[PDB]
PDB file of C-alpha atoms (C1' of nucleotides) in Angstrom:
ATOM      1  CA  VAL A   1    -102.593  46.095  73.582  1.00  0.00           C
ATOM      2  CA  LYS A   2    -100.078  48.915  72.999  1.00  0.00           C
ATOM      3  CA  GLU A   3     -99.090  51.002  76.073  1.00  0.00           C
ATOM      4  CA  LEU A   4    -100.227  48.387  78.571  1.00  0.00           C
ATOM      5  CA  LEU A   5     -98.134  45.625  76.919  1.00  0.00           C
ATOM      6  CA  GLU A   6     -95.223  47.688  77.939  1.00  0.00           C
ATOM      7  CA  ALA A   7     -96.257  48.091  81.623  1.00  0.00           C
ATOM      8  CA  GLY A   8     -95.921  44.272  81.548  1.00  0.00           C
ATOM      9  CA  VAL A   9     -92.271  43.519  80.790  1.00  0.00           C
ATOM     10  CA  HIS A  10     -90.487  46.342  78.875  1.00  0.00           C
ATOM     11  CA  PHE A  11     -89.635  49.962  79.286  1.00  0.00           C
ATOM     12  CA  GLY A  12     -86.569  52.293  79.645  1.00  0.00           C
ATOM     13  CA  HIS A  13     -82.860  51.579  79.958  1.00  0.00           C
ATOM     14  CA  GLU A  14     -79.238  52.920  80.214  1.00  0.00           C
ATOM     15  CA  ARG A  15     -76.514  53.006  82.908  1.00  0.00           C
ATOM     16  CA  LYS A  16     -76.074  56.607  81.642  1.00  0.00           C
ATOM     17  CA  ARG A  17     -74.276  55.389  78.494  1.00  0.00           C
ATOM     18  CA  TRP A  18     -76.886  57.638  76.846  1.00  0.00           C
ATOM     19  CA  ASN A  19     -77.471  60.520  74.368  1.00  0.00           C
ATOM     20  CA  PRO A  20     -78.787  63.991  75.122  1.00  0.00           C
ATOM     21  CA  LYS A  21     -81.393  64.392  72.341  1.00  0.00           C
ATOM     22  CA  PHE A  22     -82.872  61.008  73.295  1.00  0.00           C
ATOM     23  CA  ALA A  23     -83.271  62.543  76.801  1.00  0.00           C
ATOM     24  CA  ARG A  24     -85.856  64.948  75.315  1.00  0.00           C
ATOM     25  CA  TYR A  25     -87.794  61.779  74.681  1.00  0.00           C
ATOM     26  CA  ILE A  26     -86.912  60.808  78.262  1.00  0.00           C
ATOM     27  CA  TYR A  27     -89.132  60.895  81.342  1.00  0.00           C
ATOM     28  CA  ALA A  28     -87.051  60.955  84.569  1.00  0.00           C
ATOM     29  CA  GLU A  29     -83.768  59.042  85.245  1.00  0.00           C
ATOM     30  CA  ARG A  30     -84.077  57.038  88.417  1.00  0.00           C
ATOM     31  CA  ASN A  31     -82.556  53.679  89.491  1.00  0.00           C
ATOM     32  CA  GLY A  32     -79.789  55.099  87.357  1.00  0.00           C
ATOM     33  CA  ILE A  33     -82.047  53.600  84.573  1.00  0.00           C
ATOM     34  CA  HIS A  34     -83.707  56.359  82.436  1.00  0.00           C
ATOM     35  CA  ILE A  35     -87.515  56.368  82.508  1.00  0.00           C
ATOM     36  CA  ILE A  36     -88.663  55.981  78.901  1.00  0.00           C
ATOM     37  CA  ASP A  37     -91.755  57.885  77.656  1.00  0.00           C
ATOM     38  CA  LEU A  38     -93.631  55.189  75.935  1.00  0.00           C
ATOM     39  CA  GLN A  39     -96.567  57.499  75.190  1.00  0.00           C
ATOM     40  CA  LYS A  40     -95.020  59.746  72.529  1.00  0.00           C
ATOM     41  CA  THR A  41     -93.278  56.509  71.540  1.00  0.00           C
ATOM     42  CA  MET A  42     -96.774  55.296  70.688  1.00  0.00           C
ATOM     43  CA  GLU A  43     -97.037  58.403  68.524  1.00  0.00           C
ATOM     44  CA  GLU A  44     -93.845  57.469  66.783  1.00  0.00           C
ATOM     45  CA  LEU A  45     -95.070  53.850  66.406  1.00  0.00           C
ATOM     46  CA  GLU A  46     -98.157  55.303  64.697  1.00  0.00           C
ATOM     47  CA  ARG A  47     -96.203  57.093  61.975  1.00  0.00           C
ATOM     48  CA  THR A  48     -93.786  54.189  61.711  1.00  0.00           C
ATOM     49  CA  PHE A  49     -96.363  51.543  61.081  1.00  0.00           C
ATOM     50  CA  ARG A  50     -98.169  53.925  58.628  1.00  0.00           C
ATOM     51  CA  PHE A  51     -95.160  53.831  56.373  1.00  0.00           C
ATOM     52  CA  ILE A  52     -94.639  50.214  57.225  1.00  0.00           C
ATOM     53  CA  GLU A  53     -97.984  49.062  55.709  1.00  0.00           C
ATOM     54  CA  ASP A  54     -97.562  51.618  52.942  1.00  0.00           C
ATOM     55  CA  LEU A  55     -94.270  50.447  51.447  1.00  0.00           C
ATOM     56  CA  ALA A  56     -94.917  46.895  52.332  1.00  0.00           C
ATOM     57  CA  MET A  57     -98.246  46.648  50.477  1.00  0.00           C
ATOM     58  CA  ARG A  58     -96.606  48.438  47.512  1.00  0.00           C
ATOM     59  CA  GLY A  59     -93.639  46.059  47.873  1.00  0.00           C
ATOM     60  CA  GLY A  60     -89.919  46.591  48.564  1.00  0.00           C
ATOM     61  CA  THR A  61     -87.728  44.912  51.223  1.00  0.00           C
ATOM     62  CA  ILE A  62     -87.073  46.157  54.833  1.00  0.00           C
ATOM     63  CA  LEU A  63     -83.827  44.986  55.882  1.00  0.00           C
ATOM     64  CA  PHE A  64     -83.931  43.102  59.088  1.00  0.00           C
ATOM     65  CA  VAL A  65     -80.869  43.950  60.813  1.00  0.00           C
ATOM     66  CA  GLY A  66     -80.650  42.052  64.071  1.00  0.00           C
ATOM     67  CA  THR A  67     -77.142  41.161  65.311  1.00  0.00           C
ATOM     68  CA  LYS A  68     -76.911  40.850  69.097  1.00  0.00           C
ATOM     69  CA  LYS A  69     -77.394  37.070  69.691  1.00  0.00           C
ATOM     70  CA  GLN A  70     -80.630  37.425  71.653  1.00  0.00           C
ATOM     71  CA  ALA A  71     -82.449  39.632  69.119  1.00  0.00           C
ATOM     72  CA  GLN A  72     -80.693  37.935  66.303  1.00  0.00           C
ATOM     73  CA  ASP A  73     -82.012  34.498  67.070  1.00  0.00           C
ATOM     74  CA  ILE A  74     -85.649  35.465  67.513  1.00  0.00           C
ATOM     75  CA  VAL A  75     -85.606  37.943  64.595  1.00  0.00           C
ATOM     76  CA  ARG A  76     -84.162  35.323  62.330  1.00  0.00           C
ATOM     77  CA  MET A  77     -87.162  33.126  62.574  1.00  0.00           C
ATOM     78  CA  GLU A  78     -89.417  36.253  62.457  1.00  0.00           C
ATOM     79  CA  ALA A  79     -87.407  37.396  59.493  1.00  0.00           C
ATOM     80  CA  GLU A  80     -88.119  34.150  57.707  1.00  0.00           C
ATOM     81  CA  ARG A  81     -91.832  34.913  58.287  1.00  0.00           C
ATOM     82  CA  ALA A  82     -91.477  38.590  57.550  1.00  0.00           C
ATOM     83  CA  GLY A  83     -90.413  37.699  54.019  1.00  0.00           C
ATOM     84  CA  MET A  84     -87.934  40.553  53.997  1.00  0.00           C
ATOM     85  CA  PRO A  85     -84.252  39.927  53.141  1.00  0.00           C
ATOM     86  CA  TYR A  86     -82.479  39.992  56.495  1.00  0.00           C
ATOM     87  CA  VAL A  87     -79.294  40.553  58.443  1.00  0.00           C
ATOM     88  CA  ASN A  88     -78.817  37.473  60.641  1.00  0.00           C
ATOM     89  CA  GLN A  89     -75.245  37.117  62.057  1.00  0.00           C
ATOM     90  CA  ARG A  90     -72.529  39.725  62.348  1.00  0.00           C
ATOM     91  CA  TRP A  91     -73.082  42.623  59.879  1.00  0.00           C
ATOM     92  CA  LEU A  92     -70.151  42.962  57.611  1.00  0.00           C
ATOM     93  CA  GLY A  93     -68.848  45.867  55.626  1.00  0.00           C
ATOM     94  CA  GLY A  94     -69.957  45.739  52.046  1.00  0.00           C
ATOM     95  CA  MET A  95     -73.586  44.606  51.847  1.00  0.00           C
ATOM     96  CA  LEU A  96     -75.057  48.089  51.823  1.00  0.00           C
ATOM     97  CA  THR A  97     -73.025  49.884  49.155  1.00  0.00           C
ATOM     98  CA  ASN A  98     -70.993  47.201  47.380  1.00  0.00           C
ATOM     99  CA  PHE A  99     -74.251  45.825  46.132  1.00  0.00           C
ATOM    100  CA  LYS A 100     -72.925  44.200  42.938  1.00  0.00           C
ATOM    101  CA  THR A 101     -70.057  42.556  44.730  1.00  0.00           C
ATOM    102  CA  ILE A 102     -72.554  41.139  47.146  1.00  0.00           C
ATOM    103  CA  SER A 103     -74.516  39.666  44.242  1.00  0.00           C
ATOM    104  CA  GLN A 104     -71.296  38.152  43.207  1.00  0.00           C
ATOM    105  CA  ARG A 105     -70.636  36.629  46.643  1.00  0.00           C
ATOM    106  CA  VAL A 106     -74.170  35.194  46.474  1.00  0.00           C
ATOM    107  CA  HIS A 107     -73.341  33.790  42.953  1.00  0.00           C
ATOM    108  CA  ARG A 108     -70.273  31.928  44.310  1.00  0.00           C
ATOM    109  CA  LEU A 109     -72.420  30.512  47.121  1.00  0.00           C
ATOM    110  CA  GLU A 110     -75.619  29.807  45.156  1.00  0.00           C
ATOM    111  CA  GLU A 111     -73.517  28.141  42.472  1.00  0.00           C
ATOM    112  CA  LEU A 112     -71.769  26.088  45.194  1.00  0.00           C
ATOM    113  CA  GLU A 113     -75.322  24.969  45.995  1.00  0.00           C
ATOM    114  CA  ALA A 114     -76.051  24.253  42.372  1.00  0.00           C
ATOM    115  CA  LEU A 115     -72.848  22.245  42.074  1.00  0.00           C
ATOM    116  CA  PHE A 116     -73.179  20.546  45.391  1.00  0.00           C
ATOM    117  CA  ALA A 117     -75.752  18.135  44.066  1.00  0.00           C
ATOM    118  CA  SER A 118     -74.136  17.563  40.699  1.00  0.00           C
ATOM    119  CA  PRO A 119     -71.815  14.896  39.209  1.00  0.00           C
ATOM    120  CA  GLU A 120     -69.319  16.579  41.590  1.00  0.00           C
ATOM    121  CA  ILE A 121     -70.864  14.400  44.302  1.00  0.00           C
ATOM    122  CA  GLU A 122     -68.926  11.732  42.401  1.00  0.00           C
ATOM    123  CA  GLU A 123     -65.724  13.401  41.013  1.00  0.00           C
ATOM    124  CA  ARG A 124     -63.444  16.231  42.274  1.00  0.00           C
ATOM    125  CA  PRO A 125     -60.383  15.867  44.527  1.00  0.00           C
ATOM    126  CA  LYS A 126     -60.571  15.528  48.297  1.00  0.00           C
ATOM    127  CA  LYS A 127     -58.993  18.780  49.533  1.00  0.00           C
ATOM    128  CA  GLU A 128     -60.967  20.843  46.982  1.00  0.00           C
ATOM    129  CA  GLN A 129     -64.307  19.368  47.824  1.00  0.00           C
ATOM    130  CA  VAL A 130     -63.975  19.228  51.580  1.00  0.00           C
ATOM    131  CA  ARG A 131     -62.683  22.843  51.739  1.00  0.00           C
ATOM    132  CA  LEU A 132     -65.452  23.858  49.532  1.00  0.00           C
ATOM    133  CA  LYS A 133     -67.883  22.173  51.999  1.00  0.00           C
ATOM    134  CA  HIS A 134     -66.449  24.336  54.751  1.00  0.00           C
ATOM    135  CA  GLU A 135     -66.629  27.653  52.925  1.00  0.00           C
ATOM    136  CA  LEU A 136     -70.014  26.823  51.449  1.00  0.00           C
ATOM    137  CA  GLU A 137     -71.229  26.265  55.039  1.00  0.00           C
ATOM    138  CA  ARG A 138     -69.838  29.573  56.372  1.00  0.00           C
ATOM    139  CA  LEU A 139     -71.037  31.379  53.261  1.00  0.00           C
ATOM    140  CA  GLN A 140     -74.608  30.397  54.029  1.00  0.00           C
ATOM    141  CA  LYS A 141     -73.854  30.923  57.712  1.00  0.00           C
ATOM    142  CA  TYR A 142     -73.786  34.615  56.919  1.00  0.00           C
ATOM    143  CA  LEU A 143     -75.720  35.152  53.728  1.00  0.00           C
ATOM    144  CA  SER A 144     -78.909  33.344  54.631  1.00  0.00           C
ATOM    145  CA  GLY A 145     -81.534  36.127  54.585  1.00  0.00           C
ATOM    146  CA  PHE A 146     -79.320  38.190  52.407  1.00  0.00           C
ATOM    147  CA  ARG A 147     -79.359  35.466  49.733  1.00  0.00           C
ATOM    148  CA  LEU A 148     -82.797  36.970  48.707  1.00  0.00           C
ATOM    149  CA  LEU A 149     -82.008  40.637  48.249  1.00  0.00           C
ATOM    150  CA  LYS A 150     -81.886  41.688  44.518  1.00  0.00           C
ATOM    151  CA  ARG A 151     -82.899  45.217  43.802  1.00  0.00           C
ATOM    152  CA  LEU A 152     -82.867  48.676  45.486  1.00  0.00           C
ATOM    153  CA  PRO A 153     -84.094  48.101  49.056  1.00  0.00           C
ATOM    154  CA  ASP A 154     -86.367  50.890  50.454  1.00  0.00           C
ATOM    155  CA  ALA A 155     -86.291  51.124  54.306  1.00  0.00           C
ATOM    156  CA  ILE A 156     -84.639  49.061  56.800  1.00  0.00           C
ATOM    157  CA  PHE A 157     -85.961  47.682  60.010  1.00  0.00           C
ATOM    158  CA  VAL A 158     -82.950  47.035  62.185  1.00  0.00           C
ATOM    159  CA  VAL A 159     -82.526  46.778  66.061  1.00  0.00           C
ATOM    160  CA  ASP A 160     -80.190  48.954  68.330  1.00  0.00           C
ATOM    161  CA  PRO A 161     -78.757  51.358  65.743  1.00  0.00           C
ATOM    162  CA  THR A 162     -75.415  52.099  67.212  1.00  0.00           C
ATOM    163  CA  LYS A 163     -73.693  48.881  66.342  1.00  0.00           C
ATOM    164  CA  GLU A 164     -76.591  48.748  64.004  1.00  0.00           C
ATOM    165  CA  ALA A 165     -75.374  52.227  63.102  1.00  0.00           C
ATOM    166  CA  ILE A 166     -72.437  50.407  61.600  1.00  0.00           C
ATOM    167  CA  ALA A 167     -75.582  49.448  59.697  1.00  0.00           C
ATOM    168  CA  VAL A 168     -77.139  52.981  59.941  1.00  0.00           C
ATOM    169  CA  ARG A 169     -73.805  54.553  58.843  1.00  0.00           C
ATOM    170  CA  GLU A 170     -74.057  52.655  55.611  1.00  0.00           C
ATOM    171  CA  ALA A 171     -77.754  53.005  54.667  1.00  0.00           C
ATOM    172  CA  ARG A 172     -77.780  56.617  56.085  1.00  0.00           C
ATOM    173  CA  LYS A 173     -75.135  57.681  53.518  1.00  0.00           C
ATOM    174  CA  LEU A 174     -77.222  55.663  50.986  1.00  0.00           C
ATOM    175  CA  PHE A 175     -80.232  58.090  50.831  1.00  0.00           C
ATOM    176  CA  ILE A 176     -82.376  55.250  52.175  1.00  0.00           C
ATOM    177  CA  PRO A 177     -85.179  55.292  54.766  1.00  0.00           C
ATOM    178  CA  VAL A 178     -83.901  53.505  57.849  1.00  0.00           C
ATOM    179  CA  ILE A 179     -86.148  52.400  60.552  1.00  0.00           C
ATOM    180  CA  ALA A 180     -84.257  50.699  63.331  1.00  0.00           C
ATOM    181  CA  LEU A 181     -84.990  50.374  67.288  1.00  0.00           C
ATOM    182  CA  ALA A 182     -83.196  51.077  70.697  1.00  0.00           C
ATOM    183  CA  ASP A 183     -82.816  52.399  74.239  1.00  0.00           C
ATOM    184  CA  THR A 184     -81.705  56.033  75.271  1.00  0.00           C
ATOM    185  CA  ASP A 185     -78.342  54.814  74.209  1.00  0.00           C
ATOM    186  CA  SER A 186     -78.464  55.566  70.485  1.00  0.00           C
ATOM    187  CA  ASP A 187     -79.342  58.807  68.722  1.00  0.00           C
ATOM    188  CA  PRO A 188     -82.694  60.070  67.347  1.00  0.00           C
ATOM    189  CA  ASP A 189     -81.556  62.171  64.367  1.00  0.00           C
ATOM    190  CA  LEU A 190     -79.081  59.328  63.638  1.00  0.00           C
ATOM    191  CA  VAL A 191     -82.090  57.668  62.119  1.00  0.00           C
ATOM    192  CA  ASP A 192     -84.899  58.314  59.590  1.00  0.00           C
ATOM    193  CA  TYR A 193     -87.603  56.766  61.852  1.00  0.00           C
ATOM    194  CA  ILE A 194     -87.425  56.078  65.554  1.00  0.00           C
ATOM    195  CA  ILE A 195     -88.548  53.300  67.845  1.00  0.00           C
ATOM    196  CA  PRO A 196     -87.558  54.551  71.263  1.00  0.00           C
ATOM    197  CA  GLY A 197     -87.542  51.324  73.366  1.00  0.00           C
ATOM    198  CA  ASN A 198     -85.220  49.047  75.207  1.00  0.00           C
ATOM    199  CA  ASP A 199     -83.766  46.079  73.243  1.00  0.00           C
ATOM    200  CA  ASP A 200     -81.865  44.026  75.871  1.00  0.00           C
ATOM    201  CA  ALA A 201     -85.287  42.637  76.855  1.00  0.00           C
ATOM    202  CA  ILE A 202     -85.857  39.516  74.759  1.00  0.00           C
ATOM    203  CA  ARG A 203     -89.673  39.883  75.288  1.00  0.00           C
ATOM    204  CA  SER A 204     -89.668  43.486  74.046  1.00  0.00           C
ATOM    205  CA  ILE A 205     -87.889  42.235  70.919  1.00  0.00           C
ATOM    206  CA  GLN A 206     -90.521  39.578  70.461  1.00  0.00           C
ATOM    207  CA  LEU A 207     -93.459  41.922  71.002  1.00  0.00           C
ATOM    208  CA  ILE A 208     -92.624  44.986  68.947  1.00  0.00           C
ATOM    209  CA  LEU A 209     -91.138  42.832  66.295  1.00  0.00           C
ATOM    210  CA  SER A 210     -94.131  40.573  65.945  1.00  0.00           C
ATOM    211  CA  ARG A 211     -96.185  43.816  65.813  1.00  0.00           C
ATOM    212  CA  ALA A 212     -94.151  44.997  62.846  1.00  0.00           C
ATOM    213  CA  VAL A 213     -94.112  41.626  60.998  1.00  0.00           C
ATOM    214  CA  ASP A 214     -97.809  41.292  61.461  1.00  0.00           C
ATOM    215  CA  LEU A 215     -98.103  44.894  60.268  1.00  0.00           C
ATOM    216  CA  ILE A 216     -96.499  43.944  56.963  1.00  0.00           C
ATOM    217  CA  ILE A 217     -98.371  40.634  56.673  1.00  0.00           C
ATOM    218  CA  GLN A 218    -101.503  42.822  57.132  1.00  0.00           C
ATOM    219  CA  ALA A 219    -100.235  45.241  54.555  1.00  0.00           C
ATOM    220  CA  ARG A 220    -100.788  42.285  52.170  1.00  0.00           C
ATOM    221  CA  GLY A 221    -103.873  41.117  54.105  1.00  0.00           C
ATOM    222  CA  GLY A 222    -103.767  38.382  56.810  1.00  0.00           C
ATOM    223  CA  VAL A 223    -101.612  37.912  59.959  1.00  0.00           C
ATOM    224  CA  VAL A 224    -100.853  34.476  61.421  1.00  0.00           C
ATOM    225  CA  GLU A 225     -98.733  33.842  64.603  1.00  0.00           C
ATOM    226  CA  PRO A 226     -95.019  33.589  65.534  1.00  0.00           C
ATOM    227  CA  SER A 227     -93.165  30.473  66.527  1.00  0.00           C
ATOM    228  CA  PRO A 228     -90.152  31.976  68.152  1.00  0.00           C
ATOM    229  CA  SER A 229     -90.954  33.733  71.424  1.00  0.00           C
ATOM    230  CA  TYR A 230     -91.175  33.470  75.207  1.00  0.00           C
ATOM    231  CA  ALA A 231     -89.244  30.169  75.054  1.00  0.00           C
ATOM    232  CA  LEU A 232     -85.490  30.826  75.347  1.00  0.00           C
ATOM    233  CA  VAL A 233     -86.514  34.232  76.541  1.00  0.00           C
ATOM    234  CA  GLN A 234     -86.673  33.089  80.123  1.00  0.00           C
ATOM    235  CA  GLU A 235     -85.417  29.470  80.152  1.00  0.00           C
TER     236      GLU A 235
ATOM    237  C1'   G B   1      -1.384  23.964 -28.801  1.00  0.00           C
ATOM    238  C1'   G B   2      -3.290  26.859 -25.088  1.00  0.00           C
ATOM    239  C1'   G B   3      -6.985  28.344 -22.172  1.00  0.00           C
ATOM    240  C1'   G B   4     -10.836  26.871 -17.370  1.00  0.00           C
ATOM    241  C1'   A B   5     -11.812  25.762 -11.891  1.00  0.00           C
ATOM    242  C1'   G B   6     -10.504  23.741  -7.318  1.00  0.00           C
ATOM    243  C1'   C B   7      -6.337  22.843  -4.600  1.00  0.00           C
ATOM    244  C1'   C B   8      -0.796  24.158  -2.337  1.00  0.00           C
ATOM    245  C1'   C B   9       3.577  27.855  -2.164  1.00  0.00           C
ATOM    246  C1'   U B  10       6.147  32.647  -1.848  1.00  0.00           C
ATOM    247  C1'   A B  11       6.819  38.708  -1.015  1.00  0.00           C
ATOM    248  C1'   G B  12       2.771  41.980  -0.880  1.00  0.00           C
ATOM    249  C1'   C B  13      -2.494  43.622   1.110  1.00  0.00           C
ATOM    250  C1'   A B  14      -7.659  43.396   3.954  1.00  0.00           C
ATOM    251  C1'   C B  15      -7.119  40.865   7.642  1.00  0.00           C
ATOM    252  C1'   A B  16      -6.785  37.594  12.123  1.00  0.00           C
ATOM    253  C1'   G B  17      -5.332  36.295  17.506  1.00  0.00           C
ATOM    254  C1'   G B  18      -5.443  37.606  23.418  1.00  0.00           C
ATOM    255  C1'   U B  19      -6.320  32.374  29.693  1.00  0.00           C
ATOM    256  C1'   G B  20      -3.867  40.801  28.672  1.00  0.00           C
ATOM    257  C1'   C B  21      -6.585  44.688  31.765  1.00  0.00           C
ATOM    258  C1'   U B  22     -11.416  46.230  33.827  1.00  0.00           C
ATOM    259  C1'   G B  23     -18.521  42.145  36.496  1.00  0.00           C
ATOM    260  C1'   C B  24     -18.337  50.298  38.751  1.00  0.00           C
ATOM    261  C1'   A B  25     -20.526  47.870  31.634  1.00  0.00           C
ATOM    262  C1'   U B  26     -23.295  43.800  31.672  1.00  0.00           C
ATOM    263  C1'   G B  27     -26.509  39.149  30.032  1.00  0.00           C
ATOM    264  C1'   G B  28     -26.745  34.402  31.894  1.00  0.00           C
ATOM    265  C1'   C B  29     -25.859  30.550  35.990  1.00  0.00           C
ATOM    266  C1'   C B  30     -26.245  31.400  40.587  1.00  0.00           C
ATOM    267  C1'   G B  31     -23.953  32.368  46.020  1.00  0.00           C
ATOM    268  C1'   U B  32     -27.461  35.161  49.521  1.00  0.00           C
ATOM    269  C1'   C B  33     -31.050  36.930  53.575  1.00  0.00           C
ATOM    270  C1'   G B  34     -34.226  31.837  53.135  1.00  0.00           C
ATOM    271  C1'   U B  35     -38.839  27.772  52.591  1.00  0.00           C
ATOM    272  C1'   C B  36     -37.839  33.950  55.139  1.00  0.00           C
ATOM    273  C1'   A B  37     -43.575  34.477  54.728  1.00  0.00           C
ATOM    274  C1'   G B  38     -44.118  37.458  52.345  1.00  0.00           C
ATOM    275  C1'   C B  39     -45.227  40.550  47.926  1.00  0.00           C
ATOM    276  C1'   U B  40     -49.936  42.860  45.588  1.00  0.00           C
ATOM    277  C1'   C B  41     -54.693  43.591  42.872  1.00  0.00           C
ATOM    278  C1'   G B  42     -60.719  44.589  42.737  1.00  0.00           C
ATOM    279  C1'   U B  43     -64.853  47.503  44.682  1.00  0.00           C
ATOM    280  C1'   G B  44     -66.876  50.083  49.051  1.00  0.00           C
ATOM    281  C1'   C B  45     -65.439  53.102  53.070  1.00  0.00           C
ATOM    282  C1'   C B  46     -61.527  56.359  55.164  1.00  0.00           C
ATOM    283  C1'   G B  47     -58.154  61.272  54.930  1.00  0.00           C
ATOM    284  C1'   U B  48     -58.087  68.060  51.817  1.00  0.00           C
ATOM    285  C1'   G B  49     -54.104  64.887  50.454  1.00  0.00           C
ATOM    286  C1'   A B  50     -49.474  61.669  50.778  1.00  0.00           C
ATOM    287  C1'   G B  51     -51.666  57.601  51.939  1.00  0.00           C
ATOM    288  C1'   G B  52     -54.787  54.358  55.020  1.00  0.00           C
ATOM    289  C1'   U B  53     -58.111  50.135  55.072  1.00  0.00           C
ATOM    290  C1'   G B  54     -57.536  45.019  53.797  1.00  0.00           C
ATOM    291  C1'   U B  55     -52.995  42.097  56.607  1.00  0.00           C
ATOM    292  C1'   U B  56     -54.217  47.018  62.801  1.00  0.00           C
ATOM    293  C1'   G B  57     -57.026  42.458  68.159  1.00  0.00           C
ATOM    294  C1'   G B  58     -56.816  36.666  69.801  1.00  0.00           C
ATOM    295  C1'   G B  59     -55.518  31.920  69.326  1.00  0.00           C
ATOM    296  C1'   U B  60     -53.548  28.223  66.081  1.00  0.00           C
ATOM    297  C1'   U B  61     -50.364  25.974  62.500  1.00  0.00           C
ATOM    298  C1'   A B  62     -44.952  24.284  58.812  1.00  0.00           C
ATOM    299  C1'   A B  63     -46.551  29.193  57.045  1.00  0.00           C
ATOM    300  C1'   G B  64     -50.387  35.594  55.929  1.00  0.00           C
ATOM    301  C1'   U B  65     -52.539  27.862  57.417  1.00  0.00           C
ATOM    302  C1'   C B  66     -57.074  28.031  59.269  1.00  0.00           C
ATOM    303  C1'   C B  67     -60.580  30.083  62.872  1.00  0.00           C
ATOM    304  C1'   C B  68     -63.259  34.564  66.630  1.00  0.00           C
ATOM    305  C1'   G B  69     -62.688  39.716  65.989  1.00  0.00           C
ATOM    306  C1'   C B  70     -62.614  44.049  62.349  1.00  0.00           C
ATOM    307  C1'   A B  71     -64.945  48.924  57.665  1.00  0.00           C
ATOM    308  C1'   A B  72     -64.869  45.078  54.599  1.00  0.00           C
ATOM    309  C1'   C B  73     -64.996  41.273  51.364  1.00  0.00           C
ATOM    310  C1'   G B  74     -62.602  38.347  48.165  1.00  0.00           C
ATOM    311  C1'   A B  75     -58.822  37.289  44.073  1.00  0.00           C
ATOM    312  C1'   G B  76     -53.832  37.064  42.849  1.00  0.00           C
ATOM    313  C1'   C B  77     -47.405  35.317  42.244  1.00  0.00           C
ATOM    314  C1'   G B  78     -45.641  32.308  46.478  1.00  0.00           C
ATOM    315  C1'   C B  79     -47.805  29.038  50.948  1.00  0.00           C
ATOM    316  C1'   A B  80     -50.664  24.512  49.528  1.00  0.00           C
ATOM    317  C1'   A B  81     -52.330  20.842  46.398  1.00  0.00           C
ATOM    318  C1'   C B  82     -51.045  19.495  40.962  1.00  0.00           C
ATOM    319  C1'   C B  83     -45.147  15.328  38.514  1.00  0.00           C
ATOM    320  C1'   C B  84     -42.471  11.626  40.301  1.00  0.00           C
TER     321        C B  84
END
RNA sequence: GGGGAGCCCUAGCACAGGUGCUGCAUGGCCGUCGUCAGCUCGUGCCGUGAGGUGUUGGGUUAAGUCCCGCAACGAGCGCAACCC
């Protein structure tokens, strides 16, 4: 458990595409690959999961932002289990902020769903229908986990918050708690709460994330087990 | 026996008429870039602002048509389909 899980398959990163304040977190910098300090990282994880279980047991959406394919795939399934409205595919400008507009985009999609199994299965012209198939598909292709986000979200979990500081950027201006997770690449004070840990390792993703999801399922009282994992991680 | 209206004539009078000018006074019809693929709106973000964003990258199509990107996502008059 904990620190010894890391001595297994995950640790520090960076070809020196780093960030100075994160280097205060840092131990060493050999191989060219910074030597993460997973100890005080365990301290961080302590405070992190404190608020995790708190806000989760009280109830209010933490906003799975995984985007890089790897992460994304795993997290998506995990997200479905985590119960939290989630960012699956490529994060697009508008979600965080243009909230009402988003609710409208949903409405177009959801009502496409509603009127996809209607007498429209009979009627309606070909070009209209077929095109509407296409854009219905893509609409759900992006707004899957987002389709279930309807009232002031209260923290995010995210992954590597540089890209996912496109994401941070938004929720950061939005006076909102943002947990989020990365290597010595990103920035510490860029975030509200910090998980200093590599995220190009698919296993790392699996482990820390399942830890969090289980933390929120234990906020409500339980904890089962994940389906997505070691599978496509290595094969 | 006149007187009444309409209708025709003759000098008068208001009046008309113009394929006479000027499209540097114009409507309208259009010739015309040219079926060129463009023109623009909503919110968010951006810049002190003008304004930007959208539409700035890459294919692809008849085409701003569609698709991967992208601080954005749509909607609009055209494009298309809708009349033959």
